[PDB]
C-alpha cells in the first residue's frame, strides 16, 4: 500500500538523478587504453569534472528521498559525507558493459578498465570491476538500486549524528520496501534480499580504501581536488 508508493518514489529519485546505460550516447577515446600508467592527466581531467556532477546528482537524489529533508542540515551532511562514495561506486557499477569490459559515465563517456585505472582508480580498479561483475547475477533495476542506495545512505549508526533515532525510523520502511519488492520480482529465491544488503559491505570495503588513495593521488595531480569533492572526503 504505502509500501508501493515508497518504492515508486525511490525509483523515481534514482531514474531522474541517474540515466540508464541505454539512454546514453556512448563514446570512447584511445588515451592510455593500452598500458597501465600511474595517472593520465587528461583522463583525470574529464573524470574529476564528471565526479563533481555525480556528487551533485547524488545530493539531488538524497533530497528527493522521503523524510531526508526533515533531518537537520547537519545530519543530512553527516549521512551524505558518509555514504556518498559508496553510492557513486554502486552507481558507476550499474553502468558496466561486460563485453567491452567498460563503464559509462552520465555524459556518455565510456572507459575500459585500463583507462579507469589511469584516471585515478589505480589500486581500486580491480575491486570495482569485480563488484560490477558480481552485480550482474542480481539483475537489479532502478528501484532496487535506488533502495539499496537509500539504505546505505540512511544509516542510524553514523558517528556524530544528532538524531540517530530519527534516522533509524526513516530507514525502516526502506528495508521493508526492498524486502517486499525483491520478493515480488524473485519469489523463486528468498535470500536474494539479504544477498543484496550484503553488497553494501563490498561497497564499504572498497570506499574505505578511499582516503589512502586520495593521499597518493593528491601527489601525482597538478592542482588540487575540485572543491566539492574536497567537501565529501575531507
Amino acid at each position: 500500500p504505502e509500501v508501493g508508493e515508497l518504492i515508486e518514489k525511490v525509483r523515481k529519485a534514482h531514474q531522474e538523478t541517474f540515466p540508464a546505460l541505454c539512454q546514453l550516447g556512448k563514446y570512447t577515446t584511445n588515451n592510455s587504453s593500452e598500458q597501465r600508467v600511474s595517472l593520465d592527466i587528461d583522463l583525470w581531467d574529464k573524470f574529476s569534472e564528471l565526479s563533481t556532477k555525480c556528487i551533485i546528482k547524488t545530493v539531488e537524489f538524497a533530497k528527493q528521498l522521503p523524510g531526508f529533508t526533515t533531518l537537520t542540515i547537519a545530519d543530512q551532511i553527516t549521512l551524505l559525507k558518509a555514504a556518498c562514495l559508496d553510492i557513486l561506486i554502486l552507481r558507476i557499477c550499474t553502468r558496466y558493459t561486460p563485453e567491452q569490459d567498460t563503464m559509462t559515465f552520465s555524459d556518455g563517456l565510456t572507459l575500459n578498465r585500463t583507462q579507469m585505472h589511469n584516471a585515478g582508480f589505480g589500486p581500486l580498479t580491480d575491486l570495482v570491476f569485480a563488484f560490477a561483475n558480481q552485480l550482474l547475477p542480481l539483475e537489479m533495476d532502478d528501484a532496487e538500486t535506488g533502495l539499496l542506495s537509500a539504505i546505505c545512505l540512511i544509516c542510524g549508526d553514523r558517528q556524530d549524528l544528532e538524531q540517530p533515532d530519527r534516522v533509524d525510523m526513516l530507514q525502516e520502511p526502506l528495508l521493508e520496501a526492498l524486502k517486499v519488492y525483491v520478493r515480488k520480482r524473485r519469489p523463486s529465491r528468498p535470500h536474494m534480499f539479504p544477498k543484496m544488503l550484503m553488497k553494501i559491505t563490498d561497497l564499504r570495503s572498497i570506499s574505505a580504501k578511499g582516503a589512502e588513495r586520495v593521499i597518493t593521488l593528491k601527489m601525482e595531480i597538478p592542482g588540487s581536488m575540485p572543491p566539492l569533492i574536497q567537501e565529501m572526503l575531507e
Binding site: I56, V59, K63, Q76, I77, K81, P227, L228, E231, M232
Partner: peptide, 10 residues
C-alpha cells in the same frame, strides 16, 4: 555557506 550546504538549502 558551504558547497554542500548551498546544495542542501537551495
Amino acid at each position: 555557506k558551504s558547497l554542500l550546504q548551498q546544495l542542501l538549502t537551495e
